Amino acid sequence: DKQHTDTVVNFLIRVACQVLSRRCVNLLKTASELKLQWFDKLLMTVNYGNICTGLEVLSFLLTVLQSPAILSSFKPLQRGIAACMTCGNTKVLRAVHSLLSRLMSIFPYEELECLYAAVGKVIYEGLTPSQLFGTLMILKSACSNNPSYIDRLISVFMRSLQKMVREHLNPATSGTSELVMLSLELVKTRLAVMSMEMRKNFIQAILTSLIEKSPDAKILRAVVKIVEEWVKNPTLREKSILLVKM
Structure with missing residues (x-):
């Protein structure tokens, strides 16, 4: 496909210099050597280069996510992307979400x-709320990648909640901390x-019961949803404490 493979590279380079990348998918799907030559620069990025990295990767990586490049070549893409995530691992919400x-x-x-x-495990251990806020994103996909994750980090x-237990009860970081914490537990x-x-005696009981004392209504909706699925199939003894107390 030399006739069209060059065509996709032309826009990829043009958008790459730009950082309107959506049209690439239509051009690509209506049908790509920039990966190795350019993603190496992403490994390099430095201060504002990360900002460009965060937005630029969120632009053209999204298009290739739809493309079968990952499922086809995976490894060379990883080779040029092995350390790119580390650059965007922190200091950018856009890169981590990308x-x-x-x-x-x-x-x-x-x-x-x-x-x-x-990379994640060392990041998770760093706590020993920006640190948690950025860290929580990576573990979300990693946990969602497989049905279960190792028991060590559990x-x-x-x-992490223990840190939230005292950090949360400050009485707009309170909203942000509240937003992230409910994401983690679910x-x-x-x-x-x-x-x-x-x-059973503290995590599900003390934290959730502690949350019932919280002032924000949104968080409660999540736990009751969490409890809602739990009954759908802990035992009634565990559910009882959660239910009557709330």
Whole structure:
């Protein structure tokens, strides 16, 4: 497809210099060597280069996500994108959300799975709310990549709530902290059977009961939805404490 393969590269380079990339999908789907030559520059990016990286990657990576390039070549794309995510791993909500799109689509790659997982685990441990805010995005797709994640960081997820327990009760970072925390637990709540013997009495009970004292109405809607699915199939003893107390 040398007649048209050059055509897609022409816009890819033209948009690449620009950072209107949507029309590429139509041109591509109506049918691409820029990946290695340009994505190396993405590895380099420096301060404002990341900002361009965050927006530019969100532009043309989205188009190739629709394209079968990932499912076809995967590895050379990863080779030119191996360390690109690390550049956008933090300091940009746009990049993390952009790669978040890649993350969920990546799993449906084992060498790649250990890469952002290895990058993620160190990022998660950093807490020991921007740090959590940016960190929570990557784990969202990683958790959604597979039905369950390893049990080791599940305790770390719990300890994250402990930080929220005191950080949240400040009485507009309160809204942002509230927004992120409810996002974290919902993905965690699906497994909730790490079998650590302390979830039932504190995590599901103290945190949720603590949340019932919270002032924001939106968060409650999530937990009741979480409890709503739980009854649909914890036992009634666990549900009872959650239900009557709320």
